[PDB]
RNA sequence: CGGUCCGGCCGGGAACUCAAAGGAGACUGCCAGUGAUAAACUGGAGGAAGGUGGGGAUGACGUCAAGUCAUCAUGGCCCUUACGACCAGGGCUACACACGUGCUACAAUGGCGCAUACAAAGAGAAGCGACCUCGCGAGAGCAAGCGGACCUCAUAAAGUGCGUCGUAGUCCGGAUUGGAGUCUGCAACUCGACUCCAUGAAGUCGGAAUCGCUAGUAAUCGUGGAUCAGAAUGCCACGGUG
């Protein structure tokens, strides 16, 4: 449960579903257990917490959750005030990486008319 | 070739002597803005921005029969078509087609 | 007697010597009795010499320069087929059956009055 | 309207002496590199040992005889007229087409290395249960639409 | 030691210039009999056939640049004057060095 | 051929490459066919190559109210206390609607860390910039040698062979995302380049219609040259495999 998200898998072991939950892959959550010293023993049908807290900084390189979903959106704190046009483009369906706004836009704005 | 761009090309040579010679040693010491973070020579810092047109920016060598930036050979100053005229007159030294 | 040949392939060049009587199999001062025994071109030069059979009653020397091992094989093989057709006239007949009586040059030709990269024709009209 | 050939010189295999076993490499190769195809030929014969491999002292020259292209349709006229009739592919082309038919099936198996994929498809062609044939089934129907010709 | 620089855009004119300075050297005492030709260079140039909107179609022109230095072990009272007064030939650049 | 730090190295040599150039070879000659047995063509033998040997470089008559007031010339007409040159702002990426041409992955014939083999074209004095240290790196300190075949740019990559993950929308693949470094410049607001990361949507060769090439051709992976205050995968060349 928890570690890289807010999810509690029902009646399964502690390491389950620590994968695909954004910012974490499918394979490192199993391929790093030996480096972390984790065993898959003492299996119970109910929640536990604060036993594998060390795993958080092995499944992710820098950040999870958190953190991650707003640190990957940090630029708005310095763009969304007064007549800033990169801010206005971000409030709208428009790109801000330097890319042109009239072309290659139907993913961010929506389908063609 | 534009007479105002020809006259500017002459003014540039006479200003490279003025704003681009014997100023580089001063420019190396006045351009630092972190080593003390203190402001004490602002008039001399704004002197490095005095030249606007006489520095290696804007300056292009160009085709010397049209003023054009395009389609020329700087080893002769001639265009990729006036080189055919001058080679057909022997007027570019040793440059030939066959006859060897 | 002494028999000799030259061979050339895309900036690789070889000279070959062949003599009757016991000897060695040598390339650029190294013996093929232990050298080149893993390299990806070691057999593609030996088939013309299987017309006379090596070492026991034959001596070989190869000297080569330039090109990768695949290109050196073509150059060395032409040096061998020239030296071997000059070794005996009944071997010329067996090399002729294998087509080894021609020099392969196949140069890249020159570009004429435009047409982009050498000759590659661009895309078509509206149409 | 003028050529007339010119068959061009080709280098037969150095160890098996065969032109057909060198011809296979020209179709097995990718991006003109050829060297990896030269590492897959005969390496696919040690894997084929455990299976239905035909004449091992002939490598693939007899196993290619279990792959059966025979006819070609479309892009044709007869008697000056448009006709949907089949023609029989030239014997010097039939095996070079069979080479593409087997390497294009073998590389598109979803498992193991090419040396194993090709040994499976050559064993399964020797019992006519092979993969990648539905892509040419509508052509085989068009070849069976006519037996009376012109 | 001194060197006499001869530069030309043709492989026959550099040998005519070599024969002209050897003919003059034999006529000022002795100073040059058969100098070394050095390595060669080429420069290739393209020109356009139509003055506008076709730059794909070009024609090719060439210069073959030669260099000779002559090299002298001991100059004379005639090397420093009579060989310097030489007018040589048209199409060739002559310089004294060092 | 002589000596051998056992090496083209050194003696010494013009053999073989080779650099700057000049010749020879091929005559349908020879066999056998084709055909007003003519004119004119086609197989075979030999040869490195043969039937204008091939490929360039050579642009008749011309086609059409041919293109261009934007290379340049210049009438008619206009602006001339300016629509002129000069400055500082901006506009040809504002986004309500949108498109050629061209390229990259779709694998294990891979992705990654090592071992390992072979280049041409060229290019440089307010130039290329070394040796050696520092900077995760872009770069910086610094200033030999060479006027450019005993100096500088510059260890080309695809390819060859181990180890390792594995058919998992993929341990392959690429849009996002957030900041800091290096170089230059009025200026890095904004559509600078070079440099180091984390997140990983899409992608299983793609509907209709449709392009290139007869052989060192088509295909394919890298490296130079030119532009350049700072700015490419484009423009033009060249080599490896084929």
UniProtKB/Swiss-Prot annotation, chain A:
Keywords: Ribonucleoprotein, Ribosomal protein, RNA-binding, rRNA-binding, tRNA-binding. Part of the 30S ribosomal subunit. Forms a loose heterodimer with protein S19. Cross-links to the P site tRNA and weakly to the A site tRNA. Forms two bridges to the 50S subunit in the 70S ribosome, contacting the 16S rRNA and proteins S19 and L5. InterPro entries: Rbsml_uS13_C, Ribosomal_uS13, Ribosomal_uS13-like_H2TH, Ribosomal_uS13_bac-type, Ribosomal_uS13_CS. Belongs to the universal ribosomal protein uS13 family. GO terms for biological process: cytoplasmic translation. This is Small ribosomal subunit protein uS13. Located at the top of the head of the 30S subunit, it contacts several helices of the 16S rRNA. One of its GO terms (molecular function) is tRNA binding. HAMAP family: Ribosomal_uS13. GO terms for cellular component: cytoplasm; cytosol; cytosolic small ribosomal subunit; small ribosomal subunit. Changing residue 104 to H: In PW095; partially suppresses a rimM deletion. It comes from Escherichia coli (strain K12). Residues 93-113 are annotated as: Disordered.
Swiss-Prot record, chain B:
GO terms for cellular component: cytoplasm; cytosolic small ribosomal subunit; small ribosomal subunit. One of its GO terms (molecular function) is structural constituent of ribosome. The keyword Ubl conjugation does not apply. One of its GO terms (biological process) is translation. It comes from the Bacteria. Keywords: Ribonucleoprotein, Ribosomal protein. The keyword Membrane does not apply. InterPro entries: Ribosomal_uS14, Ribosomal_uS14_bac/plastid, Ribosomal_uS14_CS. Gene3D superfamilies: 1.10.287.1480. PANTHER family: 30S RIBOSOMAL PROTEIN S14 (PTHR19836), SMALL RIBOSOMAL SUBUNIT PROTEIN US14M (PTHR19836:SF19). HAMAP family: Ribosomal_uS14_1. Part of the 30S ribosomal subunit. Contacts proteins S3 and S10. Belongs to the universal ribosomal protein uS14 family. Binds 16S rRNA, required for the assembly of 30S particles and may also be responsible for determining the conformation of the 16S rRNA at the A site. This is Small ribosomal subunit protein uS14. It comes from Escherichia coli (strain K12). The lineage of its organism: Bacteria, Pseudomonadati, Pseudomonadota, Gammaproteobacteria, Enterobacterales.
Curated annotation (Swiss-Prot), chain C:
This is Small ribosomal subunit protein uS9. GO terms for biological process: cytoplasmic translation. Part of the 30S ribosomal subunit. Contacts 16S rRNA. Cross-links to the P site tRNA and weakly to the A site tRNA. Disulfide bonds: none annotated. Pfam families: Ribosomal_S9. It comes from Escherichia coli (strain K12). HAMAP family: Ribosomal_uS9_B (MF_00532_B). GO terms for molecular function: RNA binding; structural constituent of ribosome; tRNA binding. Keywords: Ribonucleoprotein, Ribosomal protein, RNA-binding, tRNA-binding. Belongs to the universal ribosomal protein uS9 family. The C-terminal tail plays a role in the affinity of the 30S P site for different tRNAs. Mutations that decrease this affinity are suppressed in the 70S ribosome. GO terms for cellular component: cytoplasm; cytosol; cytosolic small ribosomal subunit. The keyword Ribosomal protein applies.
Swiss-Prot record, chain D:
It comes from Escherichia coli (strain K12). GO terms for biological process: cytoplasmic translation; negative regulation of translation; ribosomal small subunit assembly; translation. The lineage of its organism: Bacteria, Pseudomonadati, Pseudomonadota, Gammaproteobacteria, Enterobacterales. The strain K12 sequence is shown. One of its GO terms (cellular component) is cytosolic small ribosomal subunit. Belongs to the universal ribosomal protein uS7 family. The gene is rpsG. One of the primary rRNA binding proteins, it binds directly to 16S rRNA where it nucleates assembly of the head domain of the 30S subunit. Is located at the subunit interface close to the decoding center, where it has been shown to contact mRNA. Has been shown to contact tRNA in both the P and E sites; it probably blocks exit of the E site tRNA. Protein S7 is also a translational repressor protein; it regulates the expression of the str operon members to different degrees by binding to its mRNA. GO terms for molecular function: mRNA binding; rRNA binding; structural constituent of ribosome; tRNA binding. Changing residue 114 to G: Significantly decreases affinity for its own mRNA. Keywords: Ribonucleoprotein, Ribosomal protein, RNA-binding, rRNA-binding, tRNA-binding. This is Small ribosomal subunit protein uS7. It comes from the Bacteria. Part of the 30S ribosomal subunit. Contacts proteins S9 and S11. Cross-links to IF3 and the P and E site tRNAs. The chain holds residues 3 to 152 of 179 of the full protein.
């Amino acid at each position: 449960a928890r570690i890289a998200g807010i999810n509690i898998p029902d009646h399964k072991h502690a390491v389950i579903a620590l994968t695909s939950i954004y910012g974490v892959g499918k394979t490192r959550s199993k391929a790093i257990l030996a480096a972390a010293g984790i065993a898959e023993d003492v299996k119970i049908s109910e929640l536990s917490e604060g036993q594998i807290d060390t795993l958080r900084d092995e499944v992710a390189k820098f950040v999870v959750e958190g953190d991650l979903r707003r640190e990957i959106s940090m630029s708005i704190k310095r763009l969304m005030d007064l007549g800033c046009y990169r801010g206005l483009r971000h409030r709208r369906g428009l790109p801000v990486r330097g890319q042109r706004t009239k072309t290659n836009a139907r993913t961010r704005k929506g389908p063609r008319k | 070739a534009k007479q105002s761009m020809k006259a500017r090309e002459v003014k540039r040579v006479a200003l490279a002597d003025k704003y681009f010679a014997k100023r580089a040693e001063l420019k190396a010491i006045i351009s630092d803005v972190n080593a003390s973070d203190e402001d004490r020579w602002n008039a001399v810092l704004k002197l490095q921005t005095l030249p606007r047109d006489s520095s290696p920016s804007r300056q292009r060598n160009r085709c010397r029969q049209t003023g054009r930036p395009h389609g020329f050979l700087r080893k002769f100053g001639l265009s990729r078509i006036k080189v055919r005229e001058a080679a057909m007159r022997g007027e570019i030294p040793g440059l030939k087609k066959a006859s060897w | 007697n002494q028999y000799y040949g030259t061979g050339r392939r895309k900036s690789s060049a070889a000279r070959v010597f062949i003599k009757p009587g016991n000897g060695k199999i040598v390339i650029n001062q190294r013996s093929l009795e232990q050298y080149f025994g893993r390299e990806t071109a070691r057999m593609v030069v030996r088939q013309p010499l299987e017309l006379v059979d090596m070492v026991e009653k034959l001596d070989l020397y190869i000297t080569v320069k330039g090109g990768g091992i695949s290109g050196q094989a073509g150059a060395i093989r032409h040096g061998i087929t020239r030296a071997l057709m000059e070794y005996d006239e009944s071997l010329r007949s067996e090399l002729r059956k294998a087509g080894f009586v021609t020099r392969d040059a196949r140069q890249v030709e020159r570009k004429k009055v435009g047409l982009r990269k050498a000759r590659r024709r661009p895309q078509f009209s509206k149409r | 309207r003028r050529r007339v050939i010119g068959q061009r010189k080709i280098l037969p295999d150095p160890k098996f002496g065969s032109e057909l076993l060198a011809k296979f490499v020209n179709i097995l190769m990718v991006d003109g590199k050829k060297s990896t195809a030269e590492s897959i030929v005969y390496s696919a014969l040690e894997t084929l040992a455990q299976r239905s491999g035909k004449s091992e002292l002939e490598a693939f020259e007899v196993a290619l005889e279990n792959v059966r292209p025979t006819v070609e349709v479309k892009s044709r006229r007869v008697g000056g007229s448009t006709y949907q009739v089949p023609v029989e592919v030239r014997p010097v082309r039939r095996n070079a087409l069979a080479m593409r038919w087997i390497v294009e099936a073998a590389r598109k198996r979803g498992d193991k290395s090419m040396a194993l994929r090709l040994a499976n498809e050559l064993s399964d062609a020797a019992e006519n249960k092979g993969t990648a044939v539905k892509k040419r089934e509508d052509v085989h129907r068009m070849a069976e639409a006519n037996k009376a010709f012109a | 030691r001194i060197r006499i620089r001869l530069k030309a855009f043709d492989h026959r004119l550099i040998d005519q210039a070599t024969a002209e300075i050897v003919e003059t050297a034999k006529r000022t005492g002795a100073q040059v009999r058969g100098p070394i030709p050095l390595p060669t260079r080429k420069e290739r140039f393209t020109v356009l056939i139509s003055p506008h909107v076709n730059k794909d179609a070009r024609d090719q022109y060439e210069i073959r640049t030669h260099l000779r230095l002559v090299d002298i072990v001991e100059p004379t009272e005639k090397t420093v004057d009579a060989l310097m007064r030489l007018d040589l030939a048209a199409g060739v650049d002559v310089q004294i060095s060092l």
